[PDB]
Design a binder for this molecule. Sequence first.
Ligand code: ZN
Lengths: 60, 125, 206, 98, 24, 80, 153
Amino acid sequence: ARKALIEKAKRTPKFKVRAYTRCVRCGRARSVYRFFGLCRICLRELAHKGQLPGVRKASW
Amino acid sequence: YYGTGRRKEAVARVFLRPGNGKVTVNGQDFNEYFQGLVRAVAALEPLRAVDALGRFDAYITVRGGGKSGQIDAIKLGIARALVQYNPDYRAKLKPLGFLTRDARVVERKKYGKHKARRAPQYSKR
Amino acid sequence: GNKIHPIGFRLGITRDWESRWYAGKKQYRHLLLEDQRIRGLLEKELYSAGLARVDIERAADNVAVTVHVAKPGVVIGRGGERIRVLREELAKLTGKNVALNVQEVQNPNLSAPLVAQRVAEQIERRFAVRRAIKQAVQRVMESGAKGAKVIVSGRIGGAEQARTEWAAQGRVPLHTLRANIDYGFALARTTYGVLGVKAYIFLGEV
Amino acid sequence: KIRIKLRGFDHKTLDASAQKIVEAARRSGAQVSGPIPLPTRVRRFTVIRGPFKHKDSREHFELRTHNRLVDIINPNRKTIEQLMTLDLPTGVEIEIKT
Amino acid sequence: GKGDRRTRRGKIWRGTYGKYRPRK
Amino acid sequence: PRSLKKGVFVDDHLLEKVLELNAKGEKRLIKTWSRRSTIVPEMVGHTIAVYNGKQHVPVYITENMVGHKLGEFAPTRTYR
Amino acid sequence: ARRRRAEVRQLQPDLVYGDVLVTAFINKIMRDGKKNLAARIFYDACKIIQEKTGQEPLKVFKQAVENVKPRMEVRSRRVGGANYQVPMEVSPRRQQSLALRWLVQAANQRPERRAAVRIAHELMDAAEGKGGAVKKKEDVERMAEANRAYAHY
RNA sequence: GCAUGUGGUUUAAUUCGAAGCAACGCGAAGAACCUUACCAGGCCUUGACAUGCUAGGGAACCCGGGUGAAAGCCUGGGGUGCCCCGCGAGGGGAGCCCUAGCACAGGUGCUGCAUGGCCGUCGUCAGCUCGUGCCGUGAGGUGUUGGGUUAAGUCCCGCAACGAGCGCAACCCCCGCCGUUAGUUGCCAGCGGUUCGGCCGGGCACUCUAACGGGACUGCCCGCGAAAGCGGGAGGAAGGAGGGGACGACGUCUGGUCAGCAUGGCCCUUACGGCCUGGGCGACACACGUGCUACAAUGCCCACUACAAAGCGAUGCCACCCGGCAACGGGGAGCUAAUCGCAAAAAGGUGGGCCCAGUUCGGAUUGGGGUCUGCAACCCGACCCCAUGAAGCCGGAAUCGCUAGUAAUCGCGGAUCAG
Ligand SMILES: [Zn+2]
């Protein structure tokens, strides 16, 4: 993530299609989950420290 | 006489009423709910076990699973209700093992794999 | 690498979440974004305070940040001047009007997070890598602890080839899902690099 | 006919919260249908362990949104007393429609 | 018959609907 | 067998730029990047220069070539 | 199997006749677990035996199997930096399995249209000691005592 | 044959990394612009972002026009708050704005042999080790070994050792039996009515739903055995770890990764930065990886008909009606979702058609005509309809997976996401 594109991908665009996601935390853009809005790496990262509520480790 | 038959995610409401000898499942004739189904006959086996065919009626309901499983499902249920009539029946039932129920459940697809077992194929290792 | 962050594995039997509440599909991601913003200040300001945990109970409009500090006499400041500031500095961010309780840390030697830091600073203070570690582990043992442990990331004493210093005592059954082991993580930034301190503290049982 | 829905994240938190409504509802009210489970809706997350590139890694995360219901028929002004502001759970959200 | 995007299965596969697989 | 429903597209950049070349008769050279645009029966006869990836390819328009787009005349990929 | 001989799966006898031998054979026709289909094949192939022969298909079936069971076989072996075909007395278990299989592999190679048909004919020409079912049997043995020059390993 | 990844060749660019096993449908869980790091051309500099300083002008703010591909450049208007001061005029000031200079912002620019973290991997393999004691001048040894046993350094017997730690096991989740608590799911299970739809009453029994708890321990019987244990039986839903998960020791490979993030160090700072427009990542004489579709009658097609789970849903899922061959469109009800919807599961079953053909097998490719998303589908989107209807008749040497509800087969759901 280049600041030149984090803060950038945040300002409203001239075309609604142009608007993509980024991770609020890492700034990653490749694969954030809408639900949390965090980079797959990031998800794990916090998922672990216990910072994402109700977010447990699946087992079945 | 109710017994409860469950098999591979599919429940079977079993009802044995002293009658002529007919099975109604989910409202239809037994042999109509199972057309072309080879192992169909399988359900009644627990009955022909004690020479009690035709003396009861079978009001049976069923939910879930597949037709080719529900069969077994009823099969068990009938068996489980059959004890209510005569507990002493176990003597001729369990030797044939009709009061058993198996965890033949569909194993979970692990990741990295194409199924529960089937791994992916590498060529030039 | 192998292992799995101990805590993240225990939330379920013994180890609650750092921010417990409820949310919808429309608010979860939002709220949470804000959550992280909070600790973005606390971590910055309450460094020297001996900061520990950051419980975050939420509800309707109300909110409640509880702060486990080792040295409350700092967060509070003189008579209640900094706890005053922080609340405003806090709402400066969140337009929610929120509570900020403060709870002292009964024994900074049992709180692995702190413990880690303890080391960290020491390492930034150009101290002795090996010793630092041993010392720390004993502190933990003496007070209570049914077991402690520490680790270092690499470049012990600014070496050219990063290594890693091992050191523990008592039990640390990382595999026993009924432990209740604190696990801390530091990060001393140094002239030669970045090093990672990792604490571990066995405690109790069933 | 007070319909009380209880949606949460921890099943013990709701159990209590739910029980807390069951108790002070029979003392001042009348005939309660008891606490009932739903369903429960899960939110799976299939993420790769390593940040680099190892498809075969993957860690599995869930998020259970438990649902509990407690019905109260014949709602008195006395029942609404005990069940006015006598709550304690934090990670529990309630909504009423009657 | 799965590639035959103009047959029964043909559509069932692609999950599309058309003159060959309708909506009842 | 491609398709743009009801309302054929053409960027106003040159549309109301080329039409103004009608009030005067003919011109010689037009240069605009929008190769997004379809070609109109109202556009025939001009010599439009379209952008490649680096060059600006000049394209003469025919009475016989009204149903295609501009991009269809500007090859990007240099080959052989 | 490294640790044990591993137990042999026990099957459910036929709903019709009741011989497990039956169930075993059907399993062999069944492809893709469409056991409801393969069931039919066998039955309708039986019905063909009734109309085409004055005999109970149940019997016909066994005698056909009985006849293709090779009692002798080859099993390659590396002694001397070479492949020496060692002929060997086949066990009970392996016969029954080899039979049913060949009955099938052979059947589907018939010029006949309908599957059930192919079985039907293969089931007869078998009990008459011919066809290919028995040929895939006589051929193996035609290797058994063909290289019996090596039965000393 | 096609999809997809990679080599290589190509290109203004075809951005970058990954490389035997442990790279190759791998980061990338979503390249048309965007993303995007590449290439072209146009444009910008205290700069798209932080904190701040010295000098000069202005509340912020908002609405136009000119040029333009956009960005940018030029220009013009209305516009004038909160503080504190002696009434005024006006003066200093906080935030906010521009200008000129400065400190500095920024850099997916090198280095994973400078690093953190996190991961692959030997290896879920059964092992790695310590205290004390004892052996040895020592390095080291013993213990951890042998004989028996186990899935296991699992346990038994023995033995200069006795313990202990990391590991195995166990604690935790899902599956199978059952019990308690709970009844807007469920049912003539038992009764009353029907538009005979569990539709209504009415009822929680059953199904179910979910929270807690019971239940197997070789505990019982026969045999083998010094013991551990092994074989067989019984009762039991389940047997000897009942099935499946999560769970990876001390370390190895200088493993990967500075393009997720962070970080030592060197390198650029009117550019190695920043905005944009268009192109490219999709290039093709070839070559390999992963796969999909098929070569057909155990079959293909059309019709009527029956059983599933687990998920997702607000501008979102869309019942139903209508237009159209149809994608779709118009209309419009329900759902905030165990009570509405995505929905049809498919294979299967009943009927009938095909008659062994390159065919009613197969669906590549190409012409043509449309739908929708969206600023925009040429480069480079899916979908529908008509026509076209290719290779291909079961695959060289070689090579992969899988020991049971598995493999094979068949359909359904989601993530990302306008599509
Ligand atoms: Zn992130």
